Short mmCIF file of all heavy atoms in Angstrom, two decimals:
data_model
loop_
_atom_site.label_atom_id
_atom_site.label_comp_id
_atom_site.label_asym_id
_atom_site.label_seq_id
_atom_site.Cartn_x
_atom_site.Cartn_y
_atom_site.Cartn_z
N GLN S 18 -145.51 41.46 113.50
CA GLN S 18 -146.21 41.63 112.24
C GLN S 18 -145.88 40.47 111.31
O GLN S 18 -144.70 40.16 111.09
CB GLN S 18 -145.85 42.96 111.58
CG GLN S 18 -146.30 44.17 112.36
CD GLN S 18 -147.80 44.23 112.55
OE1 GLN S 18 -148.56 43.91 111.64
NE2 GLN S 18 -148.23 44.63 113.74
N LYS S 19 -146.91 39.82 110.78
CA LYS S 19 -146.75 38.67 109.91
C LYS S 19 -146.79 39.08 108.45
O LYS S 19 -147.49 40.03 108.07
CB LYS S 19 -147.83 37.63 110.19
CG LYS S 19 -147.96 37.24 111.65
CD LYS S 19 -148.93 36.09 111.82
CE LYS S 19 -149.36 35.94 113.27
NZ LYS S 19 -150.26 34.77 113.46
N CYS S 20 -146.04 38.36 107.63
CA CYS S 20 -146.00 38.61 106.20
C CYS S 20 -145.52 37.35 105.50
O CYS S 20 -144.99 36.43 106.13
CB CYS S 20 -145.09 39.80 105.86
SG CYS S 20 -145.20 40.35 104.14
N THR S 21 -145.73 37.31 104.18
CA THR S 21 -145.28 36.19 103.36
C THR S 21 -143.92 36.44 102.73
O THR S 21 -143.13 35.50 102.58
CB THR S 21 -146.31 35.90 102.26
OG1 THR S 21 -146.87 37.12 101.79
CG2 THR S 21 -147.41 35.01 102.80
N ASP S 22 -143.63 37.67 102.34
CA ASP S 22 -142.36 38.02 101.71
C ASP S 22 -141.39 38.54 102.76
O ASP S 22 -141.72 39.47 103.51
CB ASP S 22 -142.57 39.07 100.62
CG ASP S 22 -141.62 38.90 99.45
OD1 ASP S 22 -140.72 38.04 99.54
OD2 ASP S 22 -141.78 39.61 98.44
N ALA S 23 -140.21 37.94 102.82
CA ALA S 23 -139.19 38.40 103.77
C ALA S 23 -138.75 39.82 103.45
O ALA S 23 -138.57 40.64 104.35
CB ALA S 23 -138.00 37.45 103.76
N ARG S 24 -138.57 40.13 102.16
CA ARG S 24 -138.10 41.46 101.77
C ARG S 24 -139.10 42.54 102.15
O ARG S 24 -138.72 43.58 102.70
CB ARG S 24 -137.81 41.48 100.27
CG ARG S 24 -136.69 40.55 99.86
CD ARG S 24 -136.90 39.97 98.48
NE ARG S 24 -138.09 39.14 98.40
CZ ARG S 24 -138.49 38.52 97.30
NH1 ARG S 24 -137.82 38.60 96.17
NH2 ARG S 24 -139.60 37.78 97.34
N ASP S 25 -140.38 42.31 101.89
CA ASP S 25 -141.39 43.31 102.23
C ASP S 25 -141.52 43.46 103.74
O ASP S 25 -141.60 44.59 104.25
CB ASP S 25 -142.73 42.93 101.61
CG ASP S 25 -142.84 43.37 100.17
OD1 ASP S 25 -142.34 44.48 99.85
OD2 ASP S 25 -143.40 42.62 99.35
N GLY S 26 -141.54 42.35 104.48
CA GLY S 26 -141.63 42.44 105.93
C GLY S 26 -140.44 43.17 106.53
O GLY S 26 -140.60 43.93 107.49
N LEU S 27 -139.25 42.94 105.99
CA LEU S 27 -138.07 43.68 106.44
C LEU S 27 -138.19 45.16 106.10
O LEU S 27 -137.81 46.02 106.90
CB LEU S 27 -136.81 43.09 105.83
CG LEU S 27 -136.20 41.87 106.54
CD1 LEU S 27 -135.16 41.20 105.66
CD2 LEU S 27 -135.58 42.28 107.87
N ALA S 28 -138.71 45.48 104.91
CA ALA S 28 -138.81 46.87 104.49
C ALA S 28 -139.80 47.65 105.36
O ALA S 28 -139.50 48.77 105.78
CB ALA S 28 -139.22 46.95 103.02
N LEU S 29 -140.97 47.08 105.64
CA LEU S 29 -141.99 47.82 106.38
C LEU S 29 -141.69 47.86 107.87
O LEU S 29 -141.61 48.94 108.47
CB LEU S 29 -143.38 47.23 106.14
CG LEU S 29 -144.05 47.31 104.77
CD1 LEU S 29 -144.27 45.94 104.17
CD2 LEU S 29 -145.37 48.03 104.91
N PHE S 30 -141.55 46.69 108.50
CA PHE S 30 -141.44 46.61 109.95
C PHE S 30 -139.99 46.53 110.42
O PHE S 30 -139.55 47.37 111.21
CB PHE S 30 -142.24 45.39 110.45
CG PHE S 30 -143.50 45.16 109.68
CD1 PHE S 30 -143.65 44.02 108.91
CD2 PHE S 30 -144.53 46.08 109.71
CE1 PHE S 30 -144.81 43.81 108.19
CE2 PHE S 30 -145.69 45.87 109.00
CZ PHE S 30 -145.83 44.73 108.24
N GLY S 31 -139.24 45.55 109.94
CA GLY S 31 -137.84 45.44 110.29
C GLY S 31 -137.51 44.17 111.04
O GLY S 31 -138.38 43.34 111.33
N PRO S 32 -136.24 44.00 111.38
CA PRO S 32 -135.81 42.77 112.07
C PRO S 32 -136.28 42.74 113.52
O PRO S 32 -136.60 43.76 114.13
CB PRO S 32 -134.29 42.83 111.98
CG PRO S 32 -133.98 44.28 111.89
CD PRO S 32 -135.10 44.89 111.10
N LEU S 33 -136.31 41.52 114.07
CA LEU S 33 -136.64 41.35 115.48
C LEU S 33 -135.52 41.86 116.37
O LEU S 33 -135.78 42.51 117.40
CB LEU S 33 -136.93 39.88 115.77
CG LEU S 33 -138.07 39.23 114.98
CD1 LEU S 33 -137.68 37.84 114.53
CD2 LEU S 33 -139.33 39.17 115.82
N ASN S 34 -134.27 41.58 116.01
CA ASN S 34 -133.14 41.99 116.82
C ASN S 34 -132.87 43.49 116.67
O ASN S 34 -133.37 44.15 115.75
CB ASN S 34 -131.88 41.21 116.43
CG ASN S 34 -131.39 40.31 117.55
OD1 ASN S 34 -132.16 39.55 118.13
ND2 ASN S 34 -130.10 40.39 117.85
N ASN S 35 -132.08 44.02 117.59
CA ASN S 35 -131.62 45.41 117.55
C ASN S 35 -130.10 45.40 117.63
O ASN S 35 -129.52 45.54 118.71
CB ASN S 35 -132.25 46.23 118.67
CG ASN S 35 -131.77 47.67 118.68
OD1 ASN S 35 -131.23 48.17 117.68
ND2 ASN S 35 -131.97 48.36 119.80
N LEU S 36 -129.45 45.23 116.48
CA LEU S 36 -128.01 45.41 116.42
C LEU S 36 -127.68 46.89 116.46
O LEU S 36 -128.41 47.72 115.91
CB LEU S 36 -127.45 44.77 115.15
CG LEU S 36 -126.77 43.42 115.29
CD1 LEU S 36 -127.67 42.44 116.01
CD2 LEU S 36 -126.37 42.88 113.93
N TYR S 37 -126.58 47.23 117.13
CA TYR S 37 -126.16 48.63 117.17
C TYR S 37 -125.37 49.02 115.94
O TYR S 37 -125.47 50.16 115.47
CB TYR S 37 -125.35 48.89 118.44
CG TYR S 37 -126.13 48.68 119.71
CD1 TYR S 37 -125.93 47.55 120.50
CD2 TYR S 37 -127.08 49.60 120.12
CE1 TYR S 37 -126.65 47.36 121.66
CE2 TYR S 37 -127.80 49.42 121.28
CZ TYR S 37 -127.58 48.29 122.05
OH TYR S 37 -128.30 48.11 123.20
N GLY S 38 -124.59 48.09 115.40
CA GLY S 38 -123.83 48.35 114.20
C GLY S 38 -122.95 47.16 113.89
O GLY S 38 -122.74 46.28 114.72
N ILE S 39 -122.43 47.16 112.66
CA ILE S 39 -121.57 46.08 112.18
C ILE S 39 -120.18 46.65 111.97
O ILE S 39 -119.99 47.61 111.22
CB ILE S 39 -122.12 45.46 110.88
CG1 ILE S 39 -123.47 44.79 111.14
CG2 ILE S 39 -121.12 44.46 110.32
CD1 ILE S 39 -124.00 44.03 109.95
N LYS S 40 -119.19 46.06 112.65
CA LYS S 40 -117.79 46.40 112.46
C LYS S 40 -117.17 45.34 111.57
O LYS S 40 -117.14 44.15 111.93
CB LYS S 40 -117.06 46.49 113.80
CG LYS S 40 -117.24 47.83 114.50
CD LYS S 40 -116.99 47.71 116.00
CE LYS S 40 -118.02 46.81 116.66
NZ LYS S 40 -117.98 46.93 118.14
N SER S 41 -116.67 45.75 110.41
CA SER S 41 -116.24 44.84 109.36
C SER S 41 -114.73 44.83 109.23
O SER S 41 -114.08 45.88 109.29
CB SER S 41 -116.87 45.23 108.02
OG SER S 41 -117.40 46.55 108.07
N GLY S 42 -114.17 43.63 109.07
CA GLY S 42 -112.76 43.46 108.78
C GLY S 42 -112.59 42.93 107.37
O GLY S 42 -113.17 41.91 107.00
N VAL S 43 -111.78 43.64 106.58
CA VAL S 43 -111.61 43.36 105.16
C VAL S 43 -110.21 42.83 104.92
O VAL S 43 -109.23 43.40 105.43
CB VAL S 43 -111.87 44.62 104.31
CG1 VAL S 43 -111.97 44.25 102.84
CG2 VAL S 43 -113.15 45.29 104.77
N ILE S 44 -110.11 41.74 104.16
CA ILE S 44 -108.84 41.11 103.83
C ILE S 44 -108.74 41.02 102.32
O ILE S 44 -109.68 40.58 101.65
CB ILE S 44 -108.72 39.71 104.46
CG1 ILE S 44 -109.51 39.65 105.77
CG2 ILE S 44 -107.26 39.36 104.71
CD1 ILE S 44 -109.65 38.28 106.32
N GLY S 45 -107.60 41.42 101.78
CA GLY S 45 -107.38 41.36 100.36
C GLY S 45 -106.43 42.45 99.92
O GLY S 45 -105.95 43.25 100.72
N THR S 46 -106.17 42.46 98.61
CA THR S 46 -105.32 43.49 98.03
C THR S 46 -105.98 44.86 98.17
O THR S 46 -107.14 44.99 98.56
CB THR S 46 -105.04 43.18 96.56
OG1 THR S 46 -106.08 43.75 95.75
CG2 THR S 46 -105.01 41.67 96.34
N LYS S 47 -105.21 45.90 97.85
CA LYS S 47 -105.73 47.26 97.93
C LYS S 47 -106.90 47.47 96.97
O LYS S 47 -107.85 48.20 97.29
CB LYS S 47 -104.62 48.26 97.65
CG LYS S 47 -103.59 48.36 98.76
CD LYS S 47 -102.69 49.57 98.57
CE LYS S 47 -101.70 49.70 99.71
NZ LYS S 47 -100.99 51.01 99.67
N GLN S 48 -106.85 46.84 95.80
CA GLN S 48 -107.98 46.89 94.87
C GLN S 48 -109.22 46.25 95.49
O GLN S 48 -110.33 46.76 95.32
CB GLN S 48 -107.61 46.22 93.56
CG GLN S 48 -106.31 46.71 92.95
CD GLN S 48 -105.24 45.63 92.90
OE1 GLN S 48 -105.40 44.63 92.20
NE2 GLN S 48 -104.16 45.83 93.64
N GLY S 49 -109.04 45.13 96.19
CA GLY S 49 -110.16 44.51 96.87
C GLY S 49 -110.77 45.41 97.94
O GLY S 49 -111.99 45.49 98.08
N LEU S 50 -109.91 46.08 98.71
CA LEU S 50 -110.42 47.01 99.73
C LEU S 50 -111.17 48.16 99.09
O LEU S 50 -112.23 48.57 99.58
CB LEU S 50 -109.27 47.53 100.58
CG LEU S 50 -109.55 48.84 101.32
CD1 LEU S 50 -110.54 48.63 102.46
CD2 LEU S 50 -108.27 49.48 101.84
N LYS S 51 -110.65 48.70 97.98
CA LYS S 51 -111.35 49.77 97.28
C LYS S 51 -112.70 49.30 96.76
O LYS S 51 -113.70 50.01 96.87
CB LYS S 51 -110.49 50.30 96.14
CG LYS S 51 -111.21 51.24 95.19
CD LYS S 51 -111.70 52.49 95.91
CE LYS S 51 -110.56 53.45 96.19
NZ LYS S 51 -111.04 54.81 96.53
#
């Protein structure tokens, strides 16, 4: 599906790839983690 706006195209149809999930590693003080 073609579109001019990236945000609208992502909202309606979605990305080409199929990621299963994002595992995130956070570095910083406890306040930063919160």
Side-chain angles (χ1 to χ4, degrees):
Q18 295 300 320
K19 308 188 196 182
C20 190
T21 37
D22 214 353
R24 296 147 297 180
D25 277 322
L27 277 166
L29 293 116
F30 324 114
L33 301 138
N34 246 49
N35 178 18
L36 258 53
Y37 297 105
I39 296 186
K40 278 158 295 193
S41 15
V43 191
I44 330 170
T46 88
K47 289 193 177 190
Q48 309 115 64
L50 159 71
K51 170 62 75 164

